[PDB]
Each structure stands twice: as C-alpha cells, then as structure tokens.
C-alpha cells in the first residue's frame, strides 16, 4: 500500500510491473482459488496500491 | 399443410438485425424510440 520513495529510477518500478504479470497475480489468484491463508484482505492488496505506481509511470520520464 | 411463420434464423436477422436497421434512417428511429421508452430489448433477433 505505502512507500517512502517518489519517482526516482522508475525503470525498476516498471520492471516490477513485469513480475505482476508473470507471478504475483498468478500465485495470489491460485492461492485464493485454493482457499489458502483464509484472508479476504490479502486478495485486496494489489487494488489501489498499483494505481499509485501506474499513475507515476504515466510520467516515468525525468526519473 | 402449414400455418403461421417459418423458424429460420437468417430471416430472423435479415429483416430486423442491428446492422440491417442501423444502415437505414427509419431503422435508427426504432433504436431512438426504444431508448426513449426505456425498453431493454433494443434488439429483437434474440
């Protein structure tokens, strides 16, 4: 949800958006479809968090 | 021998399907009047 850094070296924050398509949503959706950890907030950790990052990635130039 | 209408699916679109109406200015009035009546069945081929 929260970070202490703001739009420096955005090329690595955009490279985290590649892991978001290769593993992090695959594992989270499969884990929840497996009923594991039993947390309903855990499937709510990508929403409203990644939008803050994708907003700064709409201005990744000058980072 | 037979009564009423034939069940064939191509003649269920080739008179009143979306493009067959949208390509005619009076057929666009069916869409306008149904939006003005609030009717959910805006297409009747299904």
């Amino acid at each position: 949800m929260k970070a202490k850094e703001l739009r420096e070296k955005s090329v690595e924050e955009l490279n985290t958006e590649l892991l978001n398509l290769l593993r992090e949503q695959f594992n989270l959706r499969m884990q929840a479809a497996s009923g594991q950890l039993q947390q309903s907030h855990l499937l709510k950790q990508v929403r409203r968090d990644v939008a803050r990052v994708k907003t700064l990635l709409n201005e990744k130039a000058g980072a | 021998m037979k009564r009423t209408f034939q069940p064939s699916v191509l003649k269920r679109n080739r008179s009143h399907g979306f493009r067959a109406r949208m390509a005619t200015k009076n057929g666009r009035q069916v869409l306008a009047r149904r939006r003005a009546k609030g009717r959910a069945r805006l297409t009747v081929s299904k």
Binding site: L18, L21, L22, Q25, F26, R29, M30, A33, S34 | -
Partner: protein, 93 residues
C-alpha cells in the same frame, strides 16, 4: 519469447476433481482447469512461462456451465475449459 506477458491470465484455479492427483497413476496425461478462453496457441509454452514444466502433447475442451440460476431473474452462469497435457517424466502440474 513470442507473445506478451499480459496474455498469461490462465491456470489460476486448481482442477475440480479428486482425479487431479490420480490421473498420472493411470496414464501419462494430467488434467488442468482454464478460463473461458484457454489460449490454445500459447498454452503449450505458457506452462514453461508459469511453472518451468514442459509438455509433449496438449488438448483443450469446454465444460458447459449450465443456465438455470434464479427462476424469474435468470442470473448468468459462465462456462469453463479443461486441458489434457502429456508429461514425458514429471507428474506435478
């Protein structure tokens, strides 16, 4: 390789049958569950892109989700797809 990473929306659910852990003790081919589009052109490589497991042969079929849900409000039911994938020497997919 080849296609976009955004295409890999697949294999996000365990198979619905208790057969999922016995299929490889009967034959060389395991069962998987997929979405409304099973990515037929990518799925034979998607297993390497998600599990690093490779398969010899692939097939996909539809399991029709039925329709009856609420008598009068007629609520949507959604179809699902099932895959049969052949393993040379492995068993965990």
């Amino acid at each position: 390789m080849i296609r976009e990473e955004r295409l890999l929306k697949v294999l996000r659910a365990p198979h619905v049958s208790e057969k999922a852990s016995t299929a490889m003790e009967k034959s060389n081919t395991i069962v998987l569950k997929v979405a409304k589009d099973a990515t037929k052109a990518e799925i034979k490589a998607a297993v390497q892109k998600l599990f690093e497991v490779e398969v010899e042969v692939v097939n996909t079929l539809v399991v029709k989700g039925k329709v009856k849900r609420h008598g009068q409000r007629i609520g949507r039911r959604s179809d699902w797809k099932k895959a049969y994938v052949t393993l040379k020497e492995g068993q965990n997919l």
